[PDB]
Structures are given as C-alpha cells and as structure tokens.
Amino acid sequence: ADIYIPTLEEIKRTLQLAKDYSENVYFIYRIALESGVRLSEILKVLKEPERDICGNDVCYYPLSGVFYVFHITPLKRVEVTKWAIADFERRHAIAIKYFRKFVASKMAELSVPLDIIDFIQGRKPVSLFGIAKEQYKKYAEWLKG
C-alpha cells in the first residue's frame, strides 16, 4: 500500500547490476541498503572511513544532537562522485534514492518505532543511541538472511 517502495527482488537486481558494472558503485548501493541514509551522507562518510566503529554485530559512523550511519560491512575508502552514480543509473534499475524507502519500510515490518526509524535514517522528526542500535540490529539480522 505504498507506490515507490521497491521490492526485495528489484533491489536484489539493482545490486547485481551494480556489481557487474563496478565494485565501487556496488559498495555504495550496498551501504545505501544497509543504512537507509542519503547518497550524500554516504559519500561524505566514505572519504573518512577511519572514523567508522564496528561492534560484534553492527557498525556505525558518527556524523558531524548527533546522527549515526548504521551499517553492517566495514567501510573502505571509495572515491565515487554523485556524477559517477548518476552515470550508472542512466545506463540502467532502482534509483539509489528509493533504497531508503525500502529500508524504512522493512524496519516498520520489523516493528521499529517510526521515531527510531527517523533517527536511524538521519531525520530530526539505556540511551538514545543504545535503543537505536538494538532496533537497528533487528534490520541487520533480517538483512544477512
């Protein structure tokens, strides 16, 4: 009951298409799928990947209250520009900007409260970060399977 939310299959396909095209581009879509965070925040983060923190289950990157880019696979230094992603899309797939709609949607299926989904995804609308990480862990589990 929501139009622009991709399906797992369409996402699965875009990932593969990106993997065949480039390892750098594939890595960006991968993080987009793990985080639910804007493309711009992803690129800002991959230029300083040494600030990434990885726990046993999930990883997280502190931005700048404060937001975190939650993800699963450790960051490596990637130099893609918005331009090179845009190029990729033009040749094909799901637009990366719709990846966060999917992510927010699965998180809601996994019973993550909307205020927490907003926090995970970077929008302003025990501790705060602790609860968010435990919630994020549900999406991380689902994602690996």
Side-chain angles (χ1 to χ4, degrees):
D2 246 272
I3 310 88
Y4 294 87
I5 302 181
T7 66
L8 219 199
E9 291 64 51
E10 295 166 357
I11 268 169
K12 199 176 59 57
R13 171 192 171 253
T14 310
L15 280 181
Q16 182 193 24
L17 283 164
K19 195 165 228 313
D20 302 342
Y21 180 101
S22 188
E23 301 73 59
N24 270 11
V25 175
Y26 163 79
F27 183 71
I28 290 175
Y29 274 85
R30 195 186 165 114
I31 293 178
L33 180 70
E34 300 181 2
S35 55
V37 126
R38 287 166 184 271
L39 177 57
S40 50
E41 303 281 50
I42 301 176
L43 300 180
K44 186 169 303 193
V45 132
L46 293 173
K47 286 190 173 179
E48 273 209 68
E50 68 278 347
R51 287 149 127 220
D52 199 32
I53 299 160
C54 284
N56 287 333
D57 300 305
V58 306
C59 299
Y60 36 96
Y61 191 115
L63 295 168
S64 142
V66 183
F67 285 108
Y68 306 83
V69 175
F70 284 98
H71 61 110
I72 286 165
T73 87
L75 304 182
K76 52 192 187 50
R77 192 175 254 101
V78 166
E79 283 191 8
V80 184
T81 43
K82 245 143 297 219
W83 181 262
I85 289 293
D87 195 35
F88 164 79
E89 290 182 340
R90 188 262 301 180
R91 333 280 207 84
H92 308 77
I94 298 291
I96 201 157
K97 72 178 174 173
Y98 292 125
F99 274 54
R100 55 193 178 269
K101 292 188 160 306
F102 176 89
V103 172
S105 173
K106 295 296 173 140
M107 281 168 48
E109 292 183 20
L110 307 164
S111 271
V112 186
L114 277 36
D115 280 349
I116 294 171
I117 306 196
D118 285 341
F119 179 87
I120 284 159
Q121 286 195 321
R123 295 184 290 272
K124 43 273 120 205
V126 266
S127 63
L128 227 36
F129 170 76
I131 300 156
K133 183 163 64 78
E134 307 322 303
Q135 287 310 290
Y136 179 76
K137 275 155 91 180
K138 297 198 290 217
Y139 179 73
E141 279 292 343
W142 174 89
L143 190 52
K144 299 198 194 77

